[PDB]
Every structure is written in structure tokens, then in C-alpha cells.
Write a protein that binds this ligand. Structure first.
Ligand code: PLP
Ligand code: PLP
Ligand code: PLP
Ligand code: PLP
Lengths: 390, 390, 390, 390
């Protein structure tokens, strides 16, 4: 049979994997090796597995699974989400090329695009990707890539993938989408015209807060270049077989995890929207979200991340996060535990307040990654902390 | 006490490591986490461990140990040896800069320098680094780095680190040395004036054929840039904590392994030099090596790698590797098992024979990574195969 | 706060665990050590962690979590489910003691009780535990333990835990319940009067088909004896820290997994009950189950295991399992993949047919462990295979 | 070829292992699975791998390697050294049987034999096994097993394996030898007439202080019973595949480790014997050892463990261990780090002083497990601490 014909939950469990033919072992073995042996001089030349830096059976299973889930031809695992992004863009671009990027992107990605790319002669124009006309207006004869993230932090704004793909393609560029926030269970950019999808598997795909890693999915021709040039000759961004095996294990529960994350998040978002100490709640599942209908067409679920603004600015946000007893203070997302952060007092404390404001980070903004706990316990913890903070 | 005051074997065992203060666990715990939690808003801002992509306690132990062993200030672990090299060079260089590199370098490194760097506007001049005058003559006002490997494949030629460091420094450049072949047990480039040392830990440092990884050692100021810019904003070349833990475990036996590798290799090299079917033997421990005295000053042991040429060219080399029963056919080195390869029929089969010849790869050249088996068994296997092949 | 006060899903995620105080690492570190160090002679005497055979911080987290989930005082992890059972019974019993056991128990447990115990002078009487009067009638002055499993293979019959606990206690014996089939998410024997619960974590608790292990939960006084005598001085049945860490990771999703297993199983059970080629379907969620109302009081969900009888006996059962394309042929249960077996042709093939019949294993009986795939795909596979087999 | 024909170092590296046929992976894959799948009903019956509790390809490699190294037919891996011992003895013995055991045995083994065995109707007579006549005099018609350890703590006394084997066999009993202290590199009890060898792999065989585990080696007929009855139906003492893989990795360096341990230990023993503050030194490599010549015939090296008595009794021993700066205070042995303990103040502090004295534990006795550090550093640390303590 062919895994690409089964339902999505069946694919989550089985795609890319099968019992070991030699032993019958059901779990994918951990091929924690650096060296592969040849039977003869002739077999060594013909292969020219050889070396985990080229490929590995455990990692291959993960790559094939994620390719099935994103409806792409091929996958390539990497050492980190950032390595997935930079291996992709450094494979595609050289000195003199140009990229149009969303401004509302992950912080580390922004640093790569704003400082590292221009030092290699690759220029980047940042635009508001919620306005597809700004993408069009920034495209140049040298533009190779349009780069977007959706939903995007810190207010969970959206980008219309299908519309942007059509613009990029008419002007001769590829569209790369960072799909980390959604996972393939909730959004499928390649089905909407994107050429390449990248993820930090560190978040939902692994889901267990114990793996740093990335994945790239796209056409075989591109993935072959990302592997044999990008990984081999540029970043050296290999995923270890053990991390691939842990990610395979974590992704087995992706469907049931995303369903529970999103069911919990919708309940919490509605609680916050009814709370008179909370000025704003940013969540694609609330009908007041400015791009609500686009989200309903593009995403199968509204996600597990919420942002919200607490009354009273910086000191209220600090008092709030210092008053939670169950939510844990951390900067990651997509884990089984609920995580909370207050950027203005945590990650962006040395940034000038007016510079945070232009970046959409108000003094009272809190970001919540909703976990698998009972939502009543999460709501009770938030209610306890909000009441204290105000 | 201070680990930097003890003998080298003591440092191999103990440097960078101590019993866990919280539990007393002797083994370094495997901190297989992506997320680190803060106790309050204030602690989260002060730290701005946070995230394994920034650092991790297991990986920190490995970095500190290797810094002690190379007599450097700081270490930085990476996803692969190639990532150690490219994270280093992409941190140091930008569009318009220049590198002088040895020509006799690892194949993948050559591909990065010959094809990837120039596409980022970084030019590279390749020279014969056994001739320090060629390094001097190639240096330009824009030269930021001189890059060398010693010993170098395929004939185990050497580079005079101290002399080259003095030339590089007089002309305002840094010297980067790939010390993979030797390990810090046998050669210490920083003590001879190199600025930065890189290794593929995939070889001797781990030693067990089950980890792909790299390490960078140098001054704190540079390592901080390689970590917070190179890894964070360019390659995303993180080492996983489990790979760091395996490398810590493998390096515990580095001293006893290198002693046995080199004792075995010297016996095998002398056997091959006495064999009338073997035209040449390349090994720094043989007094006929063209740079023998330099090797005796620069290396504490002559290493575990041998190359040799079998009579009868391509078909004899193929028959030989097809006739071994104990040596395993593979392209890695530094494992506990003896590994053998015949480049002209394996890795370089589609390369034009006259192009292999200019690269020092003759049709009869065999490379041997000597393992920890009884040398009598290795010699008997080689003798059996050589006699058949001729 | 106290984890014992939160909801059950919150407890699944958080109980027994917290961020590492020394580093903030969110994931429980893998303390893969054999040795623990003391700061002084005095600290070494006071502790007399010391040695993973006594205890280990990773394994302690798992033990504490499972104790919370079963509402018991303490937990003890073991090398296998069988070791959990034998460490328990060999701690409790000595030469001259007696056990009353259900006859419908796991095969390996039956072998221990029928052959191993009597060779140590410990006698066992087997009874039909669906009939509590048979338990009472078999109790002797020497009876130390009543041992039950519920639901029990092969027809998923039940045992009334509360009623049996009252009988055992009136006659001075302890009740031990193997709760593997249900997990603490679906049944809590200690809340119904059982004294000790054992599990094979190999099944649902880990859930990922990659760990062999057991756990014991009960009063602190008993668990201390099971640890310091049973494990230390009898079975030497330690769980490795890595297996404990994997089980901690697997149990994070126990609630969402059990919900999906049981939702899928109920759909499949109803499909089979409507199928004219299927003579019988054994599933606690079907109202025709002989102990249906007891199951509704004692179990929060009817479970993920189904047994059923296909028309046409031995050859139909063999043709059926040889015709599935998605279900995998295996003898375990509780994995994320759907597993199927036909005992009469697989595990019990050399047993006399009339001896299988008395054991409740008819020639046409199939056992199904329902996984996390789309139930429509599982049903389509079963329908395809049943139609072929008949 | 056949691994049993090669030299011992070659066997250490290669025995039981080969490149994976399906992939060529050189490292033995980690088959971290609980479940094995069958291709058809017929293959499932024929096998009746099936289940890691029966066997596993990773663990099988370790078992085969250790069988080669001990010159035995078959091996069986276990959860701990204690499980290797109890699985062996509980397989061999039943109610009414008798064991003659050395008195100078590992503490936990003594507890099993003195308290657990008699509660199962199995009687044990303890004798001074340095006097083979005491073994003979204690044998009864019911004696099934003679059990010995050599060298034996706390004074490293010896037992003449060959002489004791002949006595046991003439009287119809099996000889079981715990060979943990020596490893197969230094002593081979089966070659001297022992029937079964057990080890705690926790010590030298793994060697890296990060695995708890055991191994049993003997005839195929016995090992089959220890596996299919002892492990399956009594102790449930399975080794996890990951622990087996780590032990395979650790044992690769067994030969070079034992050579360095013993070279270091002999230097340290001679230093201590020349020290006027040290009243006695117990080490088989010193010619004053009471069984020196027996040790030279039976052991290829004198081992890595030393015991010694410091002048000044209990308080001097406590001051000494509180004054070391490099040696670590711990109760294990066979690790790469040097470990030290003072039983009278650490492990035996609540034992009556006259009861320790009869057990050979004087108030001033120190036990040292010599590691792989520079021996000059170990000697300097001991000298520093001894001078302070006196
Ligand atoms: C966390 C994240 C990344 C970075 O991935 P890493 O695995 O941390 O390198 C990139 N994009 C998004 C949207 C992320 O959330
Ligand atoms: C193997 C090797 C490398 C590459 O290291 P990887 O870990 O394979 O990326 C670089 N330099 C030398 C000298 C090597 O032998
Ligand atoms: C599988 C099972 C066991 C045995 O557990 P192991 O981990 O295989 O030793 C015991 N009881 C039940 C109900 C089981 O399903
Ligand atoms: C440590 C030891 C044991 C016990 O082994 P574990 O792996 O700790 O269960 C048994 N015998 C000897 C000689 C030992 O040193």
C-alpha cells in the first residue's frame, strides 16, 4: 500500500516508517553511527548510505514522514529551525540576489536577514506581509525569494499564503513559508502554492520540549541541492540520529496534541476576552481577529498560542508573570506544559520602549503557549495572577 | 583545585566535568531539553541558560574540556566538523575578504572554499602550505585568515604551524588549524601560535564511530562571536546534548586510544615499508618521510593514519580492498575498528585519472585508519590481501 | 503548590516533575549514571542518592508521577512488567505462604505462579475471579495475597475490584491488581480498596512501543520493602534512567492517547458487532458485555483493546490476519500503531485445540490493540481482510 | 571468518558485532523497541525476534561478545549485576537445595544468600573459600552450586578457581564465579573449570560509570534456561537495549583500559607500600600478598583495585578521605575516574566495630579504585591527604 492514500492521523503514525525488514523491530532503530561500510570496492563507487552527514536511515524516516504530512516531494532534517531557514536561503541565494521578507518574523531569523545576509552581498527588503501589495512593490529583478511566517508574533497576524504565492510566482520568485506555529496538522503552505516549507521541529512537531531541530520540505530537485550543497558545503547543519528518533516519537501524537492544544487555547482565549482587566486578546479563533475569515480558510484550527495585553502596562505584566503558579516562565512554545512570557520585561528589557512599540510589543503584552493541562487549571492560574497583578 | 594544573591524562578524564552539585551524580547528566525556565521576570531579563541553541550544561562541559586540552580560552561545539569550519570562517569573513588556504585539505572543506565562499564575495587562494613562502606570496590587504590542515591527506604531508603562524600574524591575518587528524593529545596548534583550532569530533575525539560533530577552540572574544553570531545567526549548527554527552564519554579514553592507535600504526607502517609489493608508505613515524624532523618537533606521536601505494595500480588496489577480511571498507577515520579505502576506485572513481594524479591520488594509493585490534591480526589481514592482489 | 490538588491532565503533565533547580532545564535530565559522589565521609554515612540500584533522580520522577496518578503513596520502577509482579510477590511471600490468583491472567504471570512459586514453597490456587465467591472459598490461613487482572484476556472479562478487596481484607490478605490494560487514566484500583497496583509500562503508560518496563504503586511502608529487599536482594530488577526518561516522555500524552484509543476502539467494536461474518465481539463498551454495568462503575472509559471471533475458525482467522494491510501482526498492546494477533495460529499454535478452548481461546478469536490512526482506515482494513477471509 | 580465531584485542573490538546488512551502518543500531512484527501468521508461529523481554538484536550482540571473551557458549544480559547472580541461582535452585558460598563476597550478594534464599527453602553454608578444604567439608547431597568471587573484598584475597572447580565437580555441583573484579581481560574462570561466570557490567566491562547491568556466561543449555525461565518467569531482569548499546561501546576499550588501570594501580600500590604512615597494602601485584603465586597463575594482570590501612584508625581514615582533592568519594569501582572509600566511616558506620573487624574491615581500611588519570597526580593527591590525616 501507499501511505499517501491514508487519512492524516494514519499518516502521522505510519508515514515514512515500517517495521525493520531484517529484524521485525517495530520502532525505527536508532542508527547512531557516523560510519557506513561497503561490501566491495564496486559498491563503494556505486553509492558515490555512506556517512550520516550525507544521510541516515533514522533521519530519512523523519524526512519522508514530514514530506508526506506537508504534501511535498522530499524532506531534509537540520540541527535547528534556524539551520533549516539559513540552509534554505543560503542554498538559493548568492551575492547580488535579493529577498523580500515579512517584517513580523522570528527574532533570530530577522537577525540573519538584517545583518548576516547583507554581509554576503544578499540584500533584503522588509515589508508588512499582511499587505500583499507591499510585497509586490518591493520585488526587484534580482529577487529570488519571498519569505513569510504565518501566524506571526507578537499579535498573531496572518499572511495570505495563496495570494502571496501568486504574486511571487508572477514575478519569478520562490515563496518560502515558516510553518512552525501551525504544524502540517493545521496549515499546509505547499497546497496553497508555497514552494518550500521550513519548520523548527523544536516546537509542535516534536512537541516534548527536549529536541532542537529543523526540517525543510519541498521539491526533490531543491531538496537535493539543500542537502548536497547547503548542508554539505555551507552550514554543516546535520540533525543527529537520536534527535531524529525523538522527533519521530514526538510526532506520533501530533494530531491528538494539536487538537488538545487548540481546544484548550480557544477556551482560554474566550476567558481572557471576557476579563475586564485584559485590554486585548490576540487569537485567530476569536471572531474579532482582523483577519478572521482568512484564518478560517487557510488554517484547520486556530492554534495553541495566545497573546494578550494586561491593564497597567509594564509593572502589571511583571507582577502577573511573577504570580502564576502553574504556567512556567520560558521563551519556547509548542511544549506539553503551558509556557508564559512577558517580552517587555524579559526578552526585550534593554530595547528602547518606543522601539518595542513600533515592533508591536506593548509594555503589557503577554504571550502564552497553551499546554495539555486541564484548561480549568490554566484558567484558574491566569485568573489568580491577573487579579493579583491589577 | 584547578584542572589546568594537572597532567594531560588527568585533564582528559576530569576537565570541564564535576559531580552534579544537586544530586552527586558522577556522570554529566544528559540535559536533553530545548527549554529552560526562569524563576521570575527579573531572572529572565538578567540572563538576557535560556535555550539549548544558546548553550546547554552538557555541551558546556564538552566545550570546557576541549578548551583545556587545546590550551585555549573557550570552546564551541557544533553539529559537524564541517559546521565547525564554516561557522568559524563565516563569522570571520564577509564580502570582499580573502582567505589563503592549503590545497591539501579535506574534500568537503575544499568544496566550501572553492564554490561557496566566492558566491558570498569571499575569495580564496589555494597554495602548497608545505612551502610557507607560497602562503606569504598569496597574502593580500584583504586577507583575514590563513587556513591549514596538518597532517594532510592523501600522503600525510605536514605544515609548519609555528612558521606559518608567524607569517600570518606579520601580515595581519589569523591562523586557523584543522587539528582533526592528530587530536589535542598529539598536537596543540594554539601552543605553536595558531589563533583558532577546529576539529571534526567525528574522528578521534569521540573515537567510537557513532557521533557526527565538531568543535571550535580559541579566544573567548572570538568564541563569543562564533556562538552568538555564527551559530545563532548564520549556520544554526548546534550540537545536540546527547551527542555532546557521547563525545564526553568517548574522549575519556582519548589518551589510551591514541597511544594504542599510534603503537599499532607504527608497527603496520614498518611492515608495509618492508613489503616488496608496496612501492611507497606515507607515515610521519618513518624516517624517510620528507618532513620527518618537523613532525618530531610538532607532534608528540606520529598518528594512527597510514597511506601506501600497492604495486599494480588501479586493479591491484581494487583486488586488495576486496580481499581483506578484518579491515572494513569505509571512508571515515579515527574509529576503534581498522578502516580501509581505495580512493581511485571508491570516492574518486568518476574523477579523471590525470586529475586524481595532480591531487596526489595515484591509482594504487590505499588509506588505512588503524584501529585498536591486535596489530598482528591487522598485519596478517594486510599480508593476506596484498599477496592475493599482486 | 501541590500537584495532588490539580486536575488529572495537569497531573499527567506535571506530577513528579519540575524544572531543574541548578540549571532551569525544563525536561527532567537523564541521570544516566551508576555512581554518585559524596562531599565528605560524613555525608556518605548520612545517606547510608548513592547508586542507581538504590534510586536515581530520573526514575524517582517517574515513580512520584505514577504514585500521584494512581492515588498511592509511593512508586517503584522496574526492568519489566514481569519484574514489577515478581518483585512484589517475592517481597510479600515466603515458603509456606499461599496466593489466590485469577486464572484469566497474563501468560507469563501464569507461568511464574504455576511453576516458579511452588518451587520456592509458595502455593497458588487459581480461581475464576469473575465469581468473588470462588476467591473466598480458596482462601486459607496462609493466604497472603489475592492477585487479579481486570479487564482480563482473552475475552475482556472483568473483576469487581471493590468487592474482591473487601473479601481479601476480611480474611487478612492484601489485594494486588495488575492495571496494565486500563492505565490510571481509566481505572484506579487503590481508590477501590486494592493495596498494591502493578503495571507493565511497556503498554499504555509509555505508549510508544519502545520501552520494556514496569511500575509498582502502593503504601510507603510496602514500597520501601519492595525497593530495599525485593529489588536489592531478590530480583535486581532495576529500570534504567534512560527508560525512565522515555516513559516520563510517553506518559505526558497518556490522557489524550487514552481518549483517542477508546474513541477509536468503540467505533471499531460497533462496526464489528454489525458485521455478519463476525460471530462475537468482546468489548466493555458494548452493552451486551456480560459485566457491562460493573465496567461502567469501575472504568472511566472502556479501553482500547477488542477481541472478536471470525466465522470459519482457524483457517479464517489465519486468512484474515494475512490479509490486513495497515494493522501490524504483533503480540504487544498499547502502542500508537494498531496491532492484531490470532492466538490459535500464532502464540498458541502448539497448544492442543481442546486445551486452548478451556482457556477461552477459540480457533477464530482475534485480538486487536486499537491505535491512533484514523478509525475509518482501521475499519476499512478490517472490512477488506474479513471479506477476503470468509 | 570466525571471531573466535582472532587475538583478544581484535575480539574485544569485533566479536558479536558486524556492519548492519540492511544499511551498512558500522555501529550496532540501538533497537530501542518493545514490539517486533511478523510478516504472516505462519512466521509468528515459527518464531514461537518477538519481544525485547525474550531477546533484542542490540543485546544479542553484547551477549555474543561477552561469550567470546569468556570462552563460553552463550551470554545473557541483565538489569544489574545482582540480577545476573539471582537469575542464575534462582534458575538453578529450588526449595530443599543447598549452596556453598564464599563468605568474602559482595555485600548485596551476601544479603540475598543469607536472608532471601532461606526464605525460599534454599539453604546456604558460608565458608572461607581461600581454604578449599572448607568448601569440601560443607558440601551435602543437596548442594547444587558452589559460589565464589576472586579477588574478594575487602583485602583482595583470592580463590583457587581450578582447585575449587575440581572439588565441586567431584561432588556433583556446579561452580559459579563472579568475575566482576577482573573482567575477562584479566581472568577467565570458564577456562579454569568454572561452569558459569557472572559479572556486574556496571564496573569494568562498561567502565564509564553510566550503566547498571549484569551478564551471565555459560553453556547454551543453561543460558537457555536462565533466559526462558529465570528472566522470563522469575526475575524479569531485562537489560534495556540502550544500556546494552552503551556497554558494547564501553567494552570496545576494555583492553586498553585494563592495561592502564593495572599499570597505574601497581605504581600506586608500590608508593603506598613504601609510605611509613601506611601499615598494610593489599594488592595482588605486591609479592608480599599471601596468595601471590596463585594470582600470577590465575590472573594475567593484578587488577585496578587496592586496599590499604592508614595509621591512626577511624579518625585518620576519615581525615584522609576528607583531604583528597582529585580522588572522588564513592562506593562503585571500575570507572575511568579514581574512586576512594573508607568503609568504617561510610558504608559500615552503623555496624558494630567488633563486627566490622570479623568481616576484615578495620577502622583504618581504605579502598581505592584506580582510574585513568596520570598516576603521578593520583600519588600526589594520596600523599597530600595521608600527610594531613596523620
Ligand atoms: C523557535 C522558532 C524558530 C527557531 O527554531 P530553532 O529550532 O530554535 O532554531 C524559527 N521560527 C519560528 C516561527 C520559531 O518559533
Ligand atoms: C571528517 C573530517 C572533517 C569533516 O567533519 P565532519 O564531522 O564529517 O563534518 C573535516 N576535517 C577533517 C580533517 C576530517 O577528517
Ligand atoms: C505485557 C503485560 C505484562 C508483562 O509486562 P512486560 O513489560 O512485558 O514484562 C504483564 N501484565 C499485563 C496485563 C501485560 O499486558
Ligand atoms: C558492584 C558488584 C556487584 C553488583 O552489581 P550491580 O550492577 O551493582 O547490581 C556484584 N558483584 C561484584 C563483585 C560487584 O563489584
Amino acid at each position: 500500500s501507499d501511505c499517501r492514500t491514508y487519512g492524516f492521523n494514519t499518516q502521522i503514525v505510519h508515514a515514512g516508517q515500517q517495521p525493520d525488514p531484517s529484524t521485525g523491530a517495530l520502532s525505527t532503530p536508532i542508527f547512531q553511527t557516523s560510519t557506513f561500510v561497503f561490501d566491495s570496492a564496486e559498491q563503494g563507487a556505486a553509492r558515490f548510505y555512506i556517512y550520516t552527514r550525507l544521510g541516515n536511515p533514522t533521519t530519512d524516516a523523519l524526512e519522508k514522514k514530514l514530506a508526506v504530512l506537508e504534501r511535498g516531494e522530499a524532506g531534509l532534517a537540520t540541527a535547528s529551525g534556524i539551520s533549516a531557514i539559513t540552509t534554505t536561503l543560503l542554498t538559493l541565494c548568492q551575492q547580488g540576489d535579493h529577498i523580500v521578507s515579512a517584517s513580523a518574523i522570528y527574532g533570530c531569523t530577522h537577525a540573519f536577514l538584517s545583518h548576516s545576509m547583507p554581509k554576503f552581498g544578499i540584500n533584503v527588503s522588509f515589508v508588512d506581509a499582511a499587505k500583499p501589495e507591499e510585497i509586490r512593490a518591493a520585488m526587484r529583478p534580482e529577487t529570488k525569494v519571498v519569505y513569510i511566517e504565518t501566524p506571526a508574533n507578537p499579535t498573531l497576524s496572518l499572511v495570505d499564503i495563496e495570494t502571496v504565492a501568486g504574486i511571487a510566482h508572477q514575478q519569478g520568485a520562490l515563496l518560502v513559508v515558516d510553518n512552525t506555529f501551525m504544524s502540517p496538522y493545521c496549515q499546509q503552505p505547499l497546497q496553497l502554492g508555497a514552494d518550500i516549507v521550513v519548520h523548527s521541529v523544536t516546537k509542535y512537531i516534536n512537541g516534548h520540549g527536549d529536541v532542537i531541530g529543523g526540517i525543510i520540505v519541498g521539491k526533490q530537485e531543491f531538496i537535493d541541492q539543500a542537502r548536497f550543497v547547503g548542508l554539505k558545503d555551507i552550514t554543516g547543519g546535520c540533525m543527529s540520529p537520536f534527535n531524529a528518533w525523538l522527533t519521530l516519537r514526538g510526532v506520533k501524537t501530533l494530531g491528538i496534541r494539536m487538537e488538545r492544544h487548540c481546544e484548550n487555547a480557544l477556551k482560554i482565549a474566550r476567558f481572557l476576552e471576557g476579563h475586564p482587566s485584559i485590554t486585548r486578546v490576540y487569537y485567530p479563533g476569536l471572531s474579532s481577529h482582523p483577519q478572521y475569515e482568512l484564518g478560517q480558510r487557510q488554517m484547520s484550527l486556530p492554534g495553541g498560542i495566545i497573546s494578550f495585553e494586561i491593564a497597567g502596562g509594564l509593572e502589571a505584566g511583571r507582577r502577573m508573570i511573577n504570580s502564576v503558579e502553574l504556567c512556567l516562565l520560558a521563551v519556547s512554545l509548542g511544549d506539553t506544559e503551558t509556557l508564559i512570557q512577558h517580552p517587555a520585561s524579559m526578552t526585550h528589557s534593554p530595547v528602547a520602549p518606543e522601539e518595542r512599540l513600533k515592533a508591536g510589543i506593548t509594555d503589557g503584552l503577554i504571550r502564552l503557549s497553551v499546554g495539555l493541562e486541564d484548561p480549568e487549571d490554566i484558567i484558574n492560574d491566569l485568573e489568580h495572577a491577573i487579579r493579583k497583578a491589577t
